[PDB]
Amino acid sequence: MNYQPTPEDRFTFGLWTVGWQGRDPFGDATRRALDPVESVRRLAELGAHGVTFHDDDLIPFGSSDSEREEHVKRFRQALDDTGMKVPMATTNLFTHPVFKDGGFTANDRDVRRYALRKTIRNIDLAVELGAETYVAWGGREGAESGGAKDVRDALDRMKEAFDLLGEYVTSQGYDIRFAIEPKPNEPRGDILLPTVGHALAFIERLERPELYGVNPEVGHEQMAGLNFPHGIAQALWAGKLFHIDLNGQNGIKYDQDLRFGAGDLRAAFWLVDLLESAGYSGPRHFDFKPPRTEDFDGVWASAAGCMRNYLILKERAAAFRADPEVQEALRASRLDELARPTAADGLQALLDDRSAFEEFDVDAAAARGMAFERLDQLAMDHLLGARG
Amino acid sequence: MNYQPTPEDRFTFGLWTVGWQGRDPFGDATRRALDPVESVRRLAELGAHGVTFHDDDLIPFGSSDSEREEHVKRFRQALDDTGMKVPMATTNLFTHPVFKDGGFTANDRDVRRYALRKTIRNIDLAVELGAETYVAWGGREGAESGGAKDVRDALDRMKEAFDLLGEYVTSQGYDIRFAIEPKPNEPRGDILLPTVGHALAFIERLERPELYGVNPEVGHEQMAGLNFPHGIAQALWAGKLFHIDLNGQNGIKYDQDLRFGAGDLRAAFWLVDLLESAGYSGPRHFDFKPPRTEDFDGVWASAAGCMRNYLILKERAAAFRADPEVQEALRASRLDELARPTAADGLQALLDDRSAFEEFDVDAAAARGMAFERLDQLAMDHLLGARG
Amino acid sequence: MNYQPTPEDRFTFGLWTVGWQGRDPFGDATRRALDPVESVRRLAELGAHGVTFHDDDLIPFGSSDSEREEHVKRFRQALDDTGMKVPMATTNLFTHPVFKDGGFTANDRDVRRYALRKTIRNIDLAVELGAETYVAWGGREGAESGGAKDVRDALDRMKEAFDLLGEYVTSQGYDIRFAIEPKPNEPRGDILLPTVGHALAFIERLERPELYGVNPEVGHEQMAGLNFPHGIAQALWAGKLFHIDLNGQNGIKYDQDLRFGAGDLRAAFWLVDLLESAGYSGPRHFDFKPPRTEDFDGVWASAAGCMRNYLILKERAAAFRADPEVQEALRASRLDELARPTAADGLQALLDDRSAFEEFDVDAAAARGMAFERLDQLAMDHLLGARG
Amino acid sequence: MNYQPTPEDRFTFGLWTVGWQGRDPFGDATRRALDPVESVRRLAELGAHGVTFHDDDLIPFGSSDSEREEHVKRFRQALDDTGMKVPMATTNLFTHPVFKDGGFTANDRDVRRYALRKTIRNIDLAVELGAETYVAWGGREGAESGGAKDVRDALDRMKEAFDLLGEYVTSQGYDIRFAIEPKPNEPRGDILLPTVGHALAFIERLERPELYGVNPEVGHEQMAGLNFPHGIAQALWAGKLFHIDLNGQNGIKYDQDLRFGAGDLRAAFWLVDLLESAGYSGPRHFDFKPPRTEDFDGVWASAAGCMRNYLILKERAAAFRADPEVQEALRASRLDELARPTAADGLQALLDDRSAFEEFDVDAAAARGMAFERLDQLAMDHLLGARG
Numbered sequence A, B, C, D: 001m002n003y004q005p006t007p008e009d010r011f012t013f014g015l016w017t018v019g020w021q022g023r024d025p026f027g028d029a030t031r032r033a034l035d036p037v038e039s040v041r042r043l044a045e046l047g048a049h050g051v052t053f054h055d056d057d058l059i060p061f062g063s064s065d066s067e068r069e070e071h072v073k074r075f076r077q078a079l080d081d082t083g084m085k086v087p088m089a090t091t092n093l094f095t096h097p098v099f100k101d102g103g104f105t106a107n108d109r110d111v112r113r114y115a116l117r118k119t120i121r122n123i124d125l126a127v128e129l130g131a132e133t134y135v136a137w138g139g140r141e142g143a144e145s146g147g148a149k150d151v152r153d154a155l156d157r158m159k160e161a162f163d164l165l166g167e168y169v170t171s172q173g174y175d176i177r178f179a180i181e182p183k184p185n186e187p188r189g190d191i192l193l194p195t196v197g198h199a200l201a202f203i204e205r206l207e208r209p210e211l212y213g214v215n216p217e218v219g220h221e222q223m224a225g226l227n228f229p230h231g232i233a234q235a236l237w238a239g240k241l242f243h244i245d246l247n248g249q250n251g252i253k254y255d256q257d258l259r260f261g262a263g264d265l266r267a268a269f270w271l272v273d274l275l276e277s278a279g280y281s282g283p284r285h286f287d288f289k290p291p292r293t294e295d296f297d298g299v300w301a302s303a304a305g306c307m308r309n310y311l312i313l314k315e316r317a318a319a320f321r322a323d324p325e326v327q328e329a330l331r332a333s334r335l336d337e338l339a340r341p342t343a344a345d346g347l348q349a350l351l352d353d354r355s356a357f358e359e360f361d362v363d364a365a366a367a368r369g370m371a372f373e374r375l376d377q378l379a380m381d382h383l384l385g386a387r388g
């Protein structure tokens, strides 16, 4: 009867989430900047396992090698003071005006080289803090008009970028993998690799595909109206779910970054059911924004709420799968047959099987109800804790 | 000053397009059935290069081996009479009630085996009529609720299906490739492999990936709000654009299948520009529905309109790329630099290049306008034939 | 601890809902036709209060005045046998090919007159069966292309139609009101009066506005990505919520008509909270389609599920509003101030109030958090029955 | 053969459009602030008729009554120097943190009174500069969660606000009308009065409805996937199109504010056709953002492009309507009958007309094609200047 999170739950938060000041395209900041050290302390008190950062969240853009050292030093002391970990790091290649047409796929070649140097310096920092995953979110790679970007050349430049980071990582002997985070649009009119599917396909063309996976975000796939649990299943099937970003989104519209559980509640349920059943072992990272209506007390309530909602859905999904009535319904709907090979007897025996065509009764087969609505109502009852 | 199509233009139409009777989820048919032989004759008069078919369009479901032979015979005589070709064929695994939970990923194993036998019989037919591409549209593979379909098991069953068709094709020595046609939803709540990206990623897990590519459709990627020209560029980059379905769509809503050029006009322009510039050599296939408001005269006007609109956009895109003013703008916007390698000097020389980081002037770089709006207005002027 | 519905709950179902045979734009029917008499009996056993009908659901199109009488007679006997009521009736002006360009706004004038006669005959039938609300869903009023429909002339023809039905109803002394049911698209490319807002605005231009209100449907407003509870609040504010259609929808896509509670679960919660708190007294009508994957047992399970899910949300919303902790949070978020007039002192005293501008501390006001995230987490806890 | 705009064309621009510095939710400004005086001069050179402003664009927030006077003085001198007019003004009730929960419908009553005082002061300024229309865009009126805002109370507070501004305007004898500008979302999760329809309906509940109309924006209705030309037709039918905001939008996504003609090109065509044919006489106002990829030269090219694209579409729509072939097609599609009353003979004669029901041939009527696809292809040919 308790939903208190603990560091064993692997809940993580970006510094930029609870640290968002509330600036949006139509208004000024409503909250003051948070000292990252303060953010690490508050989160550890909430039961969080660790934090993530962009380079620029930690070390303000343009810091001397000196102030850099200082910033890192204060941070690492806070991590030591609280026991918090840093499992993922990432680069800011979107805020500075120099990236207005992108970083790795900017039309200006000198900007692309600078984007690579800026990334490499942060990968070094990441490994030193102990991160296992390095995330790439190409928020500015894309276009508002069709002639501004040849997409085949852009994809060449993107592959070229990732191949070089792969060479760098292997040449240095680092233990760190990359994760591509897709987004369909915003802040560009259209962004390159806009969904989980496109990023997965792209990875298979890199020189060392085994170094790269995806970091899918709940709200981003939903901005394309796609089913996030299905996308995640596809990522898992491919062996490529290296990391994941949890939050909430109300439909196809601007990227809302609501706290996890807000937005589409049933998708959050089916997502939790899948992560826990596939035995996902990575961080449960929250990429969310406390609404700018909130003061700092609402910030910490919003962060706590992400963890609570995960722990409640986890208990509801486990009870659903544990319910014998549910196991019976799953058999009535033939989930068991879905898992059996269609033709383990082989092509030849299938061709010779008259019960598979010549003598197949299509009419009987047709008449068989799938019993999916009772199964779904069972899932609803479990979700709402209304199971008798 | 003429936009008359000719068979050298490679324009093709499915039998199901001009043959649509007008039945929709809320109304009865408004037009009588068209004899496929009549459809082949009318289309050849319009300047079409050939037709495509589902098995069930040609041979009514449940035909005896005898009436089958008859139907094929009348068809092939019409092809001989007109000189029309059949470059693509496909299977109907969605209309019959037996496929209500799918064909290759139906939960019932006996339905999946039947779906494979039904497909294989049509591949044989396809090769005999001379088709080079066999399209798979899994319209019923998917779900309306989350518990009804384990997506990792479904993807196993899908891969299993495609692997067996690949074994069959290679064992028979057939010259024919497969093309997966993605759709995000409808008629299922969510459909598996919902975008070009997901189908591409899936193909890399098949046993003989080189046998499979995509058949993207304009309206389907738009039902996910995605940029179709970008998706097509990604398909081309991968060497996987085996075929393409042209039509029009007004946004995220039911699959409209409007005639090509209707819908998003500028996307149609940038698509034509890309197909012609990449030297796409496949059929320009129209998958469209003449609106049920139309009688047969409007049917043939709608079909002609698809071809006309392609030929007009083709001329406008060629004039755009041929315009010296446009070539100058492309250089001002640095499309030329996009095409140059970021670091052909290699990782080490990039790390040692102080002009790439230490001494990079970010501020100057930032100040450089991309000149994309003038380039786009030039593209608009060319599209509207308002270029001075 | 029980969610059994009873006729006092006012749950109603259209004959076309549980009676849907499963025909969709890509497949044949998966279920046989249901005898309306059988549908009335099964629903009464489930605890339903009554049924609704289109004319054509009850009396097959083209029935002789004789077979008509017969059909009505069998129906009314079933109503008498079960105690079921018929609170709403409506017209089918969309299935027959003659309505392919619409009924009231068809370009052909003779089709518009026929649509009015067909409606008037059914209003007579409706009143005789005791219906209080007559619904109009103009599914075919609209267009796929811009030149096909002058929308100002179409709106003249629509107003003209509704004015004549208003004249007819008042001249006959009937006790029956009209309800306009908006839909943004499908089966037309764009449909006229596409949202609750447009229908409300239109009503204010009719000759007797007091005779007309709206019949909003959950899924239809969601096909425009709008917030249905807000739309319903606007309808209530205007005194125009005459009836309502409950179901579920997963986003902007084809009209899914899922059972109520499926789709966007939190919106269903906030909708129930609003209906019960505003004291909506009309039927709780379900306009849903049992998925064609289902046999008749799944049909009846789907129908039961709509009622169950309403009764569970009703209990969760009542517990939320009854929670003292929630009443305290509502005061912390100043819902109490929202309800107070801004300036009951009047314009002049507001102009003279220096505390309202000259001496207003904007900075203090700004700093005040709204406490909305804790309030929302409280609402989530109550919804999931995880409230301590 | 010329598309040069002139002040007689009535093209206007907000100061905030060409003045946008490029700050977006993910990046810093890419352009320096423009002096409004400079913006007025550049626009007059481009052929613009005048400018619009928010209070805060002209007079920086917190200016002394003194610096205020100064700012106004420099502006009005620029207007005198160039002959530019100021036909519309509006209030900024969204940027300052104090408006984070709204202005007129903020839960805090003291914030609502301050919002009214801030507005009234600017209406005075507006009238003095000669504006005829005062626009209200309630960008912050709305919510991210359902319990944070009782929408019936919010609508009471909104009506209360508009009623008081109406009292103020009539008490002062000012010649100025109000225009409500709808937006469905962003920056709030859901915004109140989200479409043209909802704002129109709301206006009919104000105390002096004749003082208020709508200021619809191309991109905002498109963010709900609605047809903007239809929405505008409805506004015109109601006598409520007081002003209009022109720009471009690519679908359902963040508010892009692309230059007019970009986005959905065919909708822009049908919009121009309607404005010119209904004889809309108001400003053609552009609410657009030059993309942050642009330097100031691209800013002025983007602004010129809005005007050019309007003038090209205006010529294409006029040629379409002037084409005798088009006038013939319109008769073949029975646009002429659409404009004729359905029943000017009255209810009684319609009831007695057996040719309207008893003896109506539904089958013949059904068989009649609407000829809409040829009409639309004619419209396409005219749009692309490919009309023989």
Ligand SMILES: OC[C@H]1O[C@H](O)[C@H](O)[C@@H](O)[C@@H]1O
Residues within 6 Å of the ligand: A016, A090, A091, A135, A136, A137, A139, A181, A217, A245, A287
């Ligand atoms: O990838 C790193 C992060 O960068 C930005 O914060 C993006 O907004 C966020 O979605 C992404 O997760």
Ligand SMILES: OC[C@H]1O[C@H](O)[C@H](O)[C@@H](O)[C@@H]1O
Residues within 6 Å of the ligand: B016, B090, B091, B135, B136, B137, B139, B181, B217, B245, B287
């Ligand atoms: O893949 C074969 C064809 O099957 C159906 O006709 C689909 O509606 C169409 O989109 C697809 O192209």
Ligand SMILES: OC[C@H]1O[C@H](O)[C@H](O)[C@@H](O)[C@@H]1O
Residues within 6 Å of the ligand: C016, C090, C091, C135, C136, C137, C139, C181, C217, C245, C287
């Ligand atoms: O308005 C009567 C009914 O007609 C049709 O069944 C529509 O699909 C449904 O949404 C509407 O409620």
Ligand SMILES: OC[C@H]1O[C@H](O)[C@H](O)[C@@H](O)[C@@H]1O
Residues within 6 Å of the ligand: D016, D090, D091, D135, D136, D137, D139, D181, D217, D245, D287
């Ligand atoms: O209403 C005044 C203006 O305020 C803001 O600039 C909105 O972004 C714009 O859409 C609106 O037109």
